[PDB]
RNA sequence: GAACCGGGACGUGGCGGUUGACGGCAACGUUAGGAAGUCCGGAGACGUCGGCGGGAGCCUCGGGAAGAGUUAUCUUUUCUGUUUAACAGCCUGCCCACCCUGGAAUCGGCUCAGCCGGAGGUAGGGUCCAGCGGCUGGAAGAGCACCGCACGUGGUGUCCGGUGCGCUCCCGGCGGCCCUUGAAAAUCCGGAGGACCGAAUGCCGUCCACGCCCGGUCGUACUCAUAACCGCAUCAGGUCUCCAAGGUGAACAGCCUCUGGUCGAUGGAACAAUGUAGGCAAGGGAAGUCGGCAAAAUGGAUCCGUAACUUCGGGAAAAGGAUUGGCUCUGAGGGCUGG
RNA sequence: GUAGUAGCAAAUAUUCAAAUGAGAACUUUGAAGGCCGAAGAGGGGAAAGGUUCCAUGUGAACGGCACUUGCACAUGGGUUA
């Protein structure tokens, strides 16, 4: 007894693929009598036609490995395939630094810790690659003001 | 669909000759009065349940009132 | 294709009507020599040319 | 604060389980502060004739209680007959029911 | 069920008459708020590359609740989901542009990069523009999940956050490139002009709101291909394009997986020669052969180092050398609030 | 004649149980083991085809083995602005 029609209709009614349709192997005769979507829908309620669960694909391993990477594991030279630029462009690092340093200079000017004359001087030195991070810029400002 | 903000305005549109029906939708935090007109479905939201009952019995006779 | 002219669709309809077996009672007529439909067409074997 | 209930009526009446045993399982296996069995003042387990009650002084996951109850059923080879189901009446209660085979 | 568009017709209300509205210093705002021939502008309407910024969908992390999987041991764990359309109103106001005040060297502002300012910067306060942004209506009554009762019907939930040189698409703005400068028209909007026109207050005008009526003809199944097209065929060939998950990794490389699809290539038994495809091999190392043909060797990344020659740009990954797993740690590089 | 000979060999792969049938390595269901691995063997469309779409049934022929099978054959149904 061919059940091709019932499996096709069950897939459409269940809104799933034909591979996820389960037709009760012990009720082939009962299922074979359903030739309409109304009949299929009734069989779904009765439990003779069931949508099987999705095949398992867990992310536990991926999440577990990300924890190890967050601690610095698997990050040695033997685990690197792209160039340092490919892994993280130098332009990206430069953009981060300027936005951090320019943000820091604006807030100091707004709070009047530095005047516009000192802001301009520090602004051009930041663009000139003088200060490599937030800490050194703060120390230079304190030293210059003293 | 348009929203009516004033109960007075809702009553005026409920008396229109093209108002086919009114439906009462009672949610868990307010009551919605929906009146079907020719072009738009106007909806009025009344948070106070007690204040909604007064409007319910103030609708013009002959207008099909339904409870949802 | 799905996009087709009215004229072409009409021609295709006539070809479908002509693609049938001869009635059985034709072969029982007096002095009959028509054995079968000699102009049968299958969509995959011979193309319509239009 | 949180208080959850495990309504064990259908199996207790049919002598399918021992409500006292489930109380012991929850007390030993419940983890407070990351360590099992350290209920302390935070977590208290009180049983009745046909109902188990779990109260917590801080945030307590309801699904965590289901995880432990299901584990207890598996250890007693009764999962194929029993199943933990939430109650439509109360949102802090789990009920033990049978499969409609 | 809820909207919209193009036509047709009149009615009610509203609006204007200082005959053709009002507000704002201004940029402009408001729902209406004359007008003919003629005239003018705009939209439609446009290359390519690169960097940034914004929006949407997806991916991804945590918590809450629902079901499922695992459970001798371990696992507050693993998996599935956890929804919100056009359209209408209100709010928001990106990146730019624009307006008012004010008048700048001790020059300042400012981008990743530019760049901007007495032709008016910074600053202070505004206007406008985008939206695939927010809220509400639409709309939970739907959808989905789950639990019941019957064999249609009821109940519960659909919640609260984080993250980014991520991916796809859209948009913004800027820059590079040309002896290359990268369509047209239909259609629509706006403007200049003011011939002509009402009322002494009832007529006239009205792109406003609401109500009423109308909607031709043809195409629409299916395949779109290792079987629906062409190649004489159910031919390993040929045939334009859209959507595009997780892991590894620089990577729509290769390798493995989820959704979806599929096991369709006539089968069975033996394991000779010869063959085709894939390999390996002591010692020697091109002696083989027309010829290193074929194969082998090299290969990613980090650090060091790099000659002749040169059109000074290259040569260059020249050459040569070192390092690379796992595990447990240390240091450095940020954001938002609080005077 | 050649001759029941050349030949059926790319695209990893099938196995178990049951049902149906005169007849099952090849149809259908279930279970397992594999593959495509999102520039797909997935989901659509433009050309081109023209009913191949769907249901039921089937003597032969055809689907280069076989078939209970079907893009084959027979009957009917199906494309709404
Ligand atoms: K639309
Ligand atoms: K169609
Ligand atoms: K082909
Ligand atoms: K051999
Ligand atoms: K040689
Ligand atoms: K096509
Ligand atoms: K049309
Ligand atoms: Mg990169
Ligand atoms: Mg650079
Ligand atoms: Mg052909
Ligand atoms: Mg011809
Ligand atoms: Mg133009
Ligand atoms: Mg270039
Ligand atoms: Mg972006
Ligand atoms: Mg300003
Ligand atoms: Mg809403
Ligand atoms: Mg609902
Ligand atoms: Mg693209
Ligand atoms: Mg004018
Ligand atoms: Mg179609
Ligand atoms: Mg198909
Ligand atoms: Mg296709
Ligand atoms: Mg030909
Ligand atoms: Mg990576
Ligand atoms: Mg890849
Ligand atoms: Mg050797
Ligand atoms: Mg050797
Ligand atoms: Mg040697
Ligand atoms: Mg030699
Ligand atoms: Mg020789
Ligand atoms: Mg060679
Ligand atoms: Mg050289
Ligand atoms: Mg032979
Ligand atoms: Mg061969
Ligand atoms: Mg063989
Ligand atoms: Mg093969
Ligand atoms: Mg096979
Ligand atoms: Mg492969
Ligand atoms: Mg694979
Ligand atoms: Mg692509
Ligand atoms: Mg055959
Ligand atoms: Mg078919
Ligand atoms: Mg046929």
Coordinates of N, CA and C (backbone and C1' of nucleotides) in Angstrom, one line a residue, chain C residues 1-4 12 16 21 40-44 47-48 50, chain F residues 45-52 71-75 78-79:
Chain C
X1 N 6.5 28.7 -22.0 CA 6.7 29.3 -20.6 C 5.3 29.8 -20.0
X2 N 5.4 30.2 -18.7 CA 4.1 30.7 -18.1 C 3.7 31.9 -18.9
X3 N 4.6 32.8 -19.2 CA 4.2 34.0 -20.1 C 4.0 33.5 -21.5
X4 N 2.8 33.5 -22.0 CA 2.5 33.0 -23.3 C 1.4 33.9 -23.9
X12 N -2.1 25.5 -28.7 CA -1.7 24.4 -27.9 C -3.0 23.6 -27.4
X16 N -3.8 19.5 -28.0 CA -4.2 18.6 -26.9 C -5.4 17.8 -27.3
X21 N -6.9 8.8 -28.6 CA -7.1 7.7 -29.4 C -8.4 7.8 -30.2
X40 N -0.6 10.6 -33.6 CA -0.4 10.8 -32.2 C 1.0 11.5 -31.9
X41 N 1.0 12.4 -30.9 CA 2.2 13.2 -30.6 C 2.5 13.0 -29.1
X42 N 3.7 12.8 -28.8 CA 4.2 12.9 -27.4 C 5.1 14.1 -27.2
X43 N 4.9 14.8 -26.1 CA 5.6 16.0 -25.8 C 7.1 15.9 -25.8
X44 N 7.6 14.7 -25.5 CA 9.0 14.5 -25.3 C 9.6 13.9 -26.6
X47 N 8.5 17.5 -31.2 CA 8.2 18.9 -30.8 C 7.3 19.6 -31.8
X48 N 6.5 20.5 -31.3 CA 5.5 21.2 -32.1 C 6.1 22.2 -33.1
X50 N 6.7 25.3 -32.7 CA 6.4 26.7 -32.5 C 6.3 26.9 -31.0
Chain F
rG45 P 8.4 29.0 -9.6 O5' 9.2 30.1 -10.5 C5' 8.7 31.4 -10.5 C4' 9.7 32.4 -11.0 C3' 10.0 32.3 -12.5 O3' 9.0 32.9 -13.3 C1' 12.0 32.5 -11.4
rA46 P 8.9 32.5 -14.9 O5' 10.2 33.2 -15.6 C5' 10.3 34.6 -15.5 C4' 11.4 35.1 -16.4 C3' 11.4 34.6 -17.8 O3' 10.5 35.3 -18.7 C1' 13.6 34.2 -16.9
rA47 P 9.9 34.7 -20.0 O5' 11.1 34.5 -21.0 C5' 11.1 33.7 -22.1 C4' 12.5 33.2 -22.5 C3' 12.5 32.1 -23.5 O3' 12.3 32.4 -24.8 C1' 14.1 31.7 -21.8
rA48 P 11.0 31.8 -25.6 O5' 11.3 30.2 -25.6 C5' 12.4 29.7 -26.3 C4' 12.6 28.2 -26.0 C3' 11.3 27.4 -25.9 O3' 10.9 26.9 -27.2 C1' 12.6 26.9 -24.0
rG49 P 9.3 26.7 -27.5 O5' 9.0 25.4 -26.6 C5' 9.7 24.2 -26.9 C4' 9.4 23.1 -25.8 C3' 8.0 22.7 -25.7 O3' 7.7 21.7 -26.7 C1' 8.9 23.1 -23.5
rG50 P 6.3 21.8 -27.6 O5' 5.2 21.6 -26.5 C5' 5.2 20.5 -25.6 C4' 4.2 20.6 -24.5 C3' 2.7 20.7 -25.0 O3' 1.9 19.9 -24.1 C1' 3.3 22.5 -23.5
rU51 P 1.2 18.6 -24.6 O5' 0.7 17.9 -23.2 C5' 1.7 17.5 -22.3 C4' 1.1 17.5 -20.9 C3' -0.4 17.1 -20.8 O3' -0.6 16.3 -19.6 C1' -0.2 19.2 -19.9
rU52 P 0.1 14.9 -19.4 O5' 1.4 15.2 -18.6 C5' 2.5 14.2 -18.5 C4' 3.8 14.8 -18.1 C3' 3.9 15.6 -16.8 O3' 4.1 14.7 -15.7 C1' 5.1 16.7 -18.6
rC71 P 5.7 10.2 -12.8 O5' 6.0 11.1 -14.1 C5' 4.9 11.3 -15.0 C4' 5.5 11.9 -16.3 C3' 6.1 10.8 -17.2 O3' 5.8 11.2 -18.6 C1' 7.8 12.3 -16.7
rA72 P 4.5 10.7 -19.4 O5' 4.8 9.2 -19.7 C5' 5.6 8.8 -20.7 C4' 5.3 7.4 -21.1 C3' 3.9 7.1 -21.5 O3' 3.5 7.5 -22.8 C1' 4.7 5.4 -20.0
rC73 P 2.2 8.2 -23.1 O5' 1.0 7.1 -22.9 C5' 1.0 6.0 -23.8 C4' 0.1 4.9 -23.3 C3' -1.4 5.4 -23.0 O3' -2.2 5.5 -24.1 C1' -0.6 4.1 -21.2
rA74 P -3.2 6.8 -24.2 O5' -4.4 6.3 -23.2 C5' -5.2 5.2 -23.6 C4' -6.2 4.9 -22.5 C3' -7.1 6.1 -22.0 O3' -8.2 6.4 -22.8 C1' -6.2 4.9 -20.1
rU75 P -8.7 7.9 -23.0 O5' -9.5 8.2 -21.6 C5' -10.7 7.5 -21.4 C4' -11.2 7.7 -19.9 C3' -11.4 9.1 -19.5 O3' -12.6 9.7 -20.0 C1' -10.2 8.0 -17.8
rG78 P -12.2 21.0 -13.1 O5' -10.8 21.5 -12.8 C5' -10.4 21.8 -11.4 C4' -8.9 22.0 -11.3 C3' -8.4 23.3 -12.1 O3' -8.6 24.5 -11.3 C1' -6.9 21.4 -12.5
rU79 P -8.7 25.9 -12.1 O5' -7.1 26.3 -12.3 C5' -6.4 27.0 -11.3 C4' -5.5 28.0 -11.9 C3' -6.1 29.0 -12.9 O3' -5.3 30.3 -12.9 C1' -4.5 27.8 -14.1

